[PDB]
Design a protein around this ligand. Structure first.
Ligand code: NA
Ligand code: NA
Ligand code: NA
Ligand code: NA
Lengths: 409, 204
């Protein structure tokens, strides 16, 4: 507990940019694209106010558009006088992917007609399309093969406080070891994480901070309408914060909270506000109506585990169950506790042979060990129970591919 | 119940079945079969024939059957075992786990075939486990898969009885003969024998 992430002060003019969404649509062969930027303001509306959105590729300006506030008619009462949408055409856009993280820069300027700048905001833009078609998750029209890993925010000395150096180190080790994707298990990450994934090139599953694993049954709270408000804020505020990051290609409703009606409601909310990304959730069987992707945890390659209500079918078998058509990507697999990863090759042989088996996220990146000091001041790796904490789950906090100090297992 | 239509020797296999001039002769082989056997409860599936590639004639006759008798599914293996002329994925000799990516007409692992993007049909092999002589090795691998996968609904072994004929030596003693033993040439020798039982129905 504590104030474990940055604290800052931001000054904004009274007449300000209060929000902006960036989207990129493409033609059939991705040779042409349109960047659509919806900008919202707060403060006093004036006819002389203007919004200019310009797009840059390095020091080269690719496009720019300007317009006064006033959106198209929405319903019987009119439209949003405090909003405006700019549309910019881009020919032969340099596409974003984990393979080639091409990025453009969108600058959003709030200014007066006479040319006086009031304030400017901006973001890195990655031109890419994410969509599920005919049962396959596609990125820019091509079927992905997720070489991912689950990554908790953990530091042996600083606990859950993240720093740029540690983030960069994790990303480099990941790419150097052929990983192209990461799942934010199981909450929105430090804001710099997304910036680094955008620039270095890694596919990200952004996950809502919702896990009620300890409830009995697991969905006791998620199926309770009285908890819908609290859950909704965890999902909606995540989307409102990270929707402009190209690295985020999939939204997750959380983790191990069973399957409740609140999940279906929030699943639809996301699909409604942001159709550019698929939504996944593993709770309640990995294939409920709240997930566009069959995303089981620890389902085996050939062996079925027919648990009542929430069976873990062999992944090859899962795909062809009567009426099933969705792609399958394990949100968690290959538990790396100590001397582990036996049978890892079996998953990959299957991933490569089956089009709809599009990978998974290994569990997990780093051991959650903490440093303690003996009588002589010598440091040692501690785990559950070493702090007098009880009850505890001892060494179960250590199942990463690398030690806490980032040394490889 | 399978229509008497096989043009295996043509090159390519669908040279005649894709030719509208052979539609008449083909249609009678399908239509007259249905007209004769449609009241038999034992018949649960209609087949358009065997190894004749996939031609437009197949699509036309497939529809004709669906139209006149919607009580039974229609299947046909030609042209890849999963064409628009079959309600059932019915390959011949597709293996359990191993793919055989032949050009145009691949024989995918049956487990993999089921989940190909957009595929939803059941899979029943019209032919599998070739029983030529000392054979049927790996037979249990098919059954383990049939039982685990709901949509893998079995298949038909190839085949029931050796097609050997009887001949008599100088002493009048009979012996089992195969291709070529009658002066017939060209011939495909012992290939006419791959049944689970000998011609006299003695079990292999
Ligand atoms: Na695959
Ligand atoms: Na663990
Ligand atoms: Na079956
Ligand atoms: Na034969």
């Amino acid at each position: 507990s504590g104030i474990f992430r940055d604290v800052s002060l931001l000054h904004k003019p009274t007449t300000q940019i209060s929000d902006f969404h960036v989207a990129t649509r493409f033609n059939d062969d991705f040779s042409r694209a349109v960047l659509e930027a919806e900008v919202q303001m707060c403060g006093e509306l004036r006819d002389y106010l203007r919004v200019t959105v310009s797009l840059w590729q390095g020091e080269t300006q690719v496009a720019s558009g300007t317009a006064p506030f006033g959106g198209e008619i929405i319903d019987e009462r009119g439209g949003y006088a405090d909003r405006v949408t700019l549309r910019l055409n881009v020919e032969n856009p340099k596409l974003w992917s984990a393979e080639i993280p091409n990025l453009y820069r969108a600058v959003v300027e709030l200014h007066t007609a006479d040319g006086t700048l009031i304030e400017a905001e901006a973001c890195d833009v990655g031109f890419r399309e994410v969509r599920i078609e005919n049962g396959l998750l596609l990125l820019n029209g091509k079927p992905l093969l997720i070489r991912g890993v689950n990554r908790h925010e953990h530091h042996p000395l600083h606990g859950q406080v993240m720093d740029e150096q540690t983030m960069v180190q994790d990303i480099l080790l990941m790419k150097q070891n052929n990983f192209n994707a990461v799942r934010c298990s199981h909450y929105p990450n430090h804001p710099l994480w997304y910036t680094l994934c955008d620039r270095y090139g890694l596919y990200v599953v952004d996950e809502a901070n919702i896990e009620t694993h300890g409830m009995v049954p697991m969905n006791r709270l998620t199926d309770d309408p009285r908890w819908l408000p609290a859950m909704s804020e965890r999902v909606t505020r995540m989307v409102q914060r990270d929707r402009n990051h190209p690295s985020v290609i999939i939204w997750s409703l959380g983790n191990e909270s069973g399957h409740g009606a609140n999940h279906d409601a929030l699943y639809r909310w996301i699909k409604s506000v942001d159709p550019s990304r698929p939504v996944q959730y593993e709770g309640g069987g990995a294939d409920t109506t709240a997930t566009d992707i069959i995303c089981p945890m620890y389902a085996r390659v050939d062996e079925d585990q027919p648990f009542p209500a929430v069976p873990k079918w062999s992944i090859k078998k899962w795909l062809s169950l009567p009426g099933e058509t969705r792609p399958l990507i394990l949100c968690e697999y290959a538990h790396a506790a100590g001397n582990s990863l036996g049978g890892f090759a079996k998953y990959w042989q299957a991933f490569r042979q089956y089009p709809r088996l599009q990978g998974g996220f290994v569990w997990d990146w780093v051991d959650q060990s903490l440093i303690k000091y003996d009588e002589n001041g010598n440091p040692w790796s501690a785990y559950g129970g070493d702090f007098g904490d009880t009850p505890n789950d001892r060494q179960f906090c250590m199942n990463g591919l690398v030690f806490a100090d980032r040394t490889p297992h």
